[PDB]
Design an enzyme around this catalytic site. Structure first.
Site, mmCIF file in Angstrom:
data_model
loop_
_atom_site.group_PDB
_atom_site.id
_atom_site.type_symbol
_atom_site.label_atom_id
_atom_site.label_comp_id
_atom_site.label_asym_id
_atom_site.label_seq_id
_atom_site.Cartn_x
_atom_site.Cartn_y
_atom_site.Cartn_z
ATOM 1 N N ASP A 121 -20.143 -20.366 -54.394
ATOM 2 C CA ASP A 121 -19.362 -21.461 -54.959
ATOM 3 C C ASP A 121 -20.031 -21.890 -56.253
ATOM 4 O OD1 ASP A 121 -21.482 -23.160 -53.140
ATOM 5 O OD2 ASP A 121 -20.790 -24.379 -54.831
ATOM 6 N N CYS A 176 -2.809 -15.473 -68.627
ATOM 7 C CA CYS A 176 -2.927 -14.318 -69.515
ATOM 8 C C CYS A 176 -1.608 -13.572 -69.667
ATOM 9 C CB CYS A 176 -4.037 -13.387 -69.033
ATOM 10 S SG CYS A 176 -5.704 -14.108 -69.262
ATOM 11 N N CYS A 218 -6.978 -9.152 -67.391
ATOM 12 C CA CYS A 218 -6.712 -10.194 -66.398
ATOM 13 C C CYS A 218 -5.240 -10.297 -66.001
ATOM 14 C CB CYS A 218 -7.210 -11.555 -66.913
ATOM 15 S SG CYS A 218 -6.966 -12.925 -65.748
ATOM 16 N N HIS A 250 -7.198 -19.655 -65.342
ATOM 17 C CA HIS A 250 -7.703 -18.345 -65.730
ATOM 18 C C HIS A 250 -9.109 -18.072 -65.191
ATOM 19 C CE1 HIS A 250 -9.197 -14.900 -67.940
ATOM 20 N NE2 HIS A 250 -10.216 -15.668 -68.286
ATOM 21 N N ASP A 284 -19.857 -29.480 -48.196
ATOM 22 C CA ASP A 284 -21.310 -29.603 -48.290
ATOM 23 C C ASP A 284 -21.763 -30.846 -47.522
ATOM 24 O OD1 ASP A 284 -20.725 -31.714 -50.066
ATOM 25 O OD2 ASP A 284 -21.047 -30.466 -51.827
ATOM 26 N N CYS A 331 -3.894 -12.796 -64.350
ATOM 27 C CA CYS A 331 -3.472 -14.166 -64.065
ATOM 28 C C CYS A 331 -2.234 -14.613 -64.846
ATOM 29 C CB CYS A 331 -4.625 -15.161 -64.218
ATOM 30 S SG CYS A 331 -4.836 -15.936 -65.858
HETATM 31 ZN ZN LIG Z 1 -6.371 -14.715 -67.114
#
Ligand SMILES: [Zn+2]
Ligand SMILES: [Zn+2]
Lengths: 373, 373
Positions: free
Chosen positions: B270, B313, B308, B339, B92, B310
Site C-alpha cells: 500500500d 489515457c 497504459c 491513472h 491499519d 486506463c
Molecule cells: Zn493511464
C-alpha cells in the site's frame, strides 16, 4: 444536422418547449447549461455531465484566454477535443468576467484592455477579438461582445451602454460573418441591454432584430435587483425579442428563478453553483435547498433528495456526503456537483414535459408550494 | 467463500503469486491496495477504484476515529456501507499516524494517549481499543497495534520497542479472538519489528509465529533508510516469516520498490501518492515518472503513458492534464489519481502474470532497464 434550427413543439402562455438542432447535437429547450470554467465543469468528467442529462455546456472565454490561451487550444484541436466534450458548447464573450475579475481595465469604443488577475499580463478584448477567440475555441454558439451595465444605473448611463452594446453587436455580427468556417458551422446570439428601462429595452430589441441573430439573450439581469424586479423586467422585455428564436437569460439561476423565467418566455439558462461561506455544501431538493454541512445530517441515512434519480442519490447517504464536505475531501465536491447538476436537469425535464402536456402553470404552482413549504 | 484462505498458485525464487479468499471477495497477490483516508480514496468513486483493478483498499484508522468517529460509522452500518466499497478492506491500527500527526502524545505499556491534530480533543489508543475500532469499522483485515521504531534506532531502543510490540501483538490477538463476530468473519495480521537488526527481526518473527496470525507484515521499513538498506533487511527478514501466509510490506511504495520487494517474497503493498511541492503532478509511466506540470507538456497530445490501458489515457492528453493541474482544478486530481492507481494495478498484473509464467526475473530486469533508462 443543420448549422442551426430552433423548432417550437409546444407552448403554454409565454412558455415554450422545443429543440435547437446543431451540427454537434440537439439541445432540448428549456435548457440548463452547466458551466465549464477553464475547460472543465467543476469536479466532473464530461461523460458524467452528459449522464446528468446536459445537452450543451457553457465555456467561460475569460479564463480560457488567460489559461491555457485560445491560440494554444486551437493548435491542440479546439475546446471540444481538448476537454473531451463532443456536444454543443456555448461560449460567453469574456466581457463580463473582464469587468468582475480583472484589474487596470481601460474601456473605450474600440473595446477593453486589462491586466490578468492571475498574472501581470496585459490583454485586449474587442468585439472582433472576442469573436476570434470564440472561433479559436471552436464554439458552437458564440455570444456577441457587449458592455455590461451596473445596477443601479441612471437612465443616461444605461442608454449609453446599451447604445455602445448595439454598435458592438453589429461589429460582432460582421466579424462572425467574415469568417467562413465560423459563419457556416456556428451560431451567433445577440444580447439585449437597457437595464430596467422599458424604452431602452425596446430600442435594444429593435436594434438586435434589425442586425439579425440566431438567438437573443436578455443581458444585464441578476446583477443585484432582486427577483421581483427581474421578473418585472422580463415581463416586458422578452416579448420584444423575436418569437421564433431562442431566448437566453444569462447567469440565472436558482430553481425558482428558472421556473419564473420560463413562465415569461425564456428558453436557455446557465449558472455556477455557489461555494463561498460553506455554500459548497448546498444541495438542491424538491423541498428546498439544504446545507449538508449542517450537524443535523451527520447520521442521516437518506439520499440528498428522496425522489432524485441521480447516481449520487442511488448510492450514498447524506451522512457520508456531510462527512466528505466537512473533511474537505475532493469526492465531496464530486458528489455534490453531480447531484446538483442532475437536479437541475430533472427540473428542466419536468418543465419540458409539463409544457408539452399543457400543465406547466400547474407544475409551477406545485413546484413553488413544495419548494418553499 | 471462507473467512480467510491464502493459496499460492505459482513461485519463482522467493516470489509468489496466488489468491487470498475472504468473505467479501478474492484478492489477487501480489496485491496493491489503494489507500482510503477519511473513508475515501482521494478523488475517486469506489466504482472507479474497482475499475482500475483494485481487489482491496486500505482504510486509515486514525482519521476515521477522529472524523467521523468509529462508533458513528458502526451506527451507520460500517465502513463498507458508509463509503460504498463492498469488497475487502484492510485497516491499519492507527498507531503510526498517532505518532506522525498527533500532538501531546503520551506513551506507556498500556497504549498511547494523544490530542487530535484537527481539534483539541483527547483520545486513547491501546491494543484493545485499536482492535475494537477496527471491529466498529467492519474491517476485513485487522492490523495488530504496535509501537513503531524510528530510524535510526539503537540496538537497545529497537529491542525495547520490538519487545513491547510483541506483547501488544498478543494483546491484539486476544482482543480480536474475544469478539465472536470479528473472529469468525475477519482476519488478523501481526507486524514484525526489529529495525535493521537481524537477531531482533528473528525474535520478532518467532514471537509472532508462536502467537499465530493470518498474515505477517514487515513493519518499520521505508522510514528513511534508503532502498539498498530496505532491500538488505528484506533479504533476511522475509524468510523468517511463515511461508504459507501473506507477507505485507506496509507503506511501500515506488514501482521499483514493489518489484524488488516481490523478488524478496512480499505479497501485499500500500502507499499514498505524493502531493507536496508540485508532486500531485507526478504521473507514472513505463519510462519512469514525469511531472505533468512541466512546461514541456503544455502542447503534448500524447496520453500520460503510451501503453497504459486506463480510461484517462484513452480519453485525455498530457496537454489537458498539464492545464488542469496547473489551474488547480479538481478534475486534474481526479484524472491523475485514476491513472496512477491504474498504472500500479497494471504493474501488479504484469508481476502476477510473469511469476505464473516463470519469467518474473526477466520481467524485473526489463522493467528496470526501461523505467530507469
Ligand atoms: Zn493511464
Ligand atoms: Zn441526486
Amino acid at each position: 444536422r443543420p448549422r442551426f434550427s430552433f423548432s417550437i413543439a409546444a407552448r403554454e402562455g409565454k412558455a415554450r418547449t422545443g429543440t435547437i438542432e446543431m451540427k454537434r447535437g440537439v439541445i432540448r429547450t428549456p435548457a440548463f447549461m452547466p458551466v465549464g470554467t477553464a475547460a472543465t465543469v467543476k469536479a466532473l468528467k464530461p461523460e458524467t455531465v452528459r449522464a446528468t442529462g446536459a445537452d450543451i455546456i457553457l465555456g467561460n472565454t475569460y479564463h480560457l484566454m488567460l489559461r491555457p490561451g485560445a491560440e494554444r487550444i486551437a493548435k491542440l484541436g479546439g475546446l471540444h477535443s481538448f476537454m473531451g466534450w463532443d456536444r454543443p458548447i456555448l461560449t460567453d464573450s469574456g466581457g463580463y468576467q473582464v469587468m468582475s475579475l480583472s484589474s487596470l481595465t481601460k474601456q473605450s469604443e474600440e473595446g477593453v484592455t486589462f491586466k490578468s488577475h492571475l498574472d501581470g499580463s496585459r490583454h485586449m478584448l474587442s468585439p472582433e477579438r472576442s469573436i476570434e477567440i470564440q472561433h479559436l475555441l471552436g464554439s458552437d454558439i458564440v455570444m456577441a461582445f457587449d458592455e455590461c451595465t451596473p445596477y443601479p444605473a441612471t437612465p443616461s448611463r444605461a442608454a449609453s451602454s446599451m447604445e455602445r452594446s448595439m454598435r458592438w453587436a453589429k461589429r460582432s455580427r460582421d466579424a462572425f460573418d467574415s469568417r467562413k468556417e465560423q459563419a457556416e458551422n456556428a451560431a451567433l446570439f445577440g444580447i439585449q441591454q437597457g437595464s430596467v428601462f422599458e424604452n431602452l429595452r425596446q430600442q435594444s430589441a429593435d436594434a438586435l432584430a434589425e442586425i439579425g441573430f440566431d438567438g437573443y439573450a436578455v443581458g444585464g439581469l441578476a446583477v443585484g435587483e432582486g427577483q421581483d424586479e427581474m421578473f418585472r423586467v422580463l415581463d416586458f422585455s422578452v416579448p420584444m425579442l423575436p418569437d421564433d428564436k431562442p431566448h437566453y437569460l444569462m447567469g440565472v439561476g436558482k430553481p425558482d428563478d428558472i421556473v419564473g423565467a420560463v413562465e415569461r418566455g425564456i428558453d436557455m439558462f446557465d449558472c455556477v453553483l455557489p461555494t463561498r461561506s460553506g455554500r459548497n455544501g448546498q444541495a438542491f431538493t424538491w423541498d428546498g435547498p439544504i446545507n449538508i454541512r449542517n450537524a443535523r445530517f451527520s447520521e442521516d441515512l437518506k439520499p440528498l433528495d428522496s425522489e432524485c434519480h441521480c447516481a449520487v442519490c442511488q448510492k450514498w447517504s447524506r451522512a457520508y456526503i456531510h462527512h466528505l464536505i466537512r473533511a474537505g475531501q475532493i469526492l465531496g465536491a464530486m458528489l455534490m456537483t453531480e447531484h446538483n447538476i442532475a437536479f437541475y436537469q430533472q427540473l428542466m425535464q419536468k418543465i419540458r414535459d409539463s409544457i408539452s402536456e399543457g400543465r406547466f402553470s400547474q407544475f409551477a404552482q406545485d413546484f413553488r408550494a413544495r419548494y418553499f413549504a
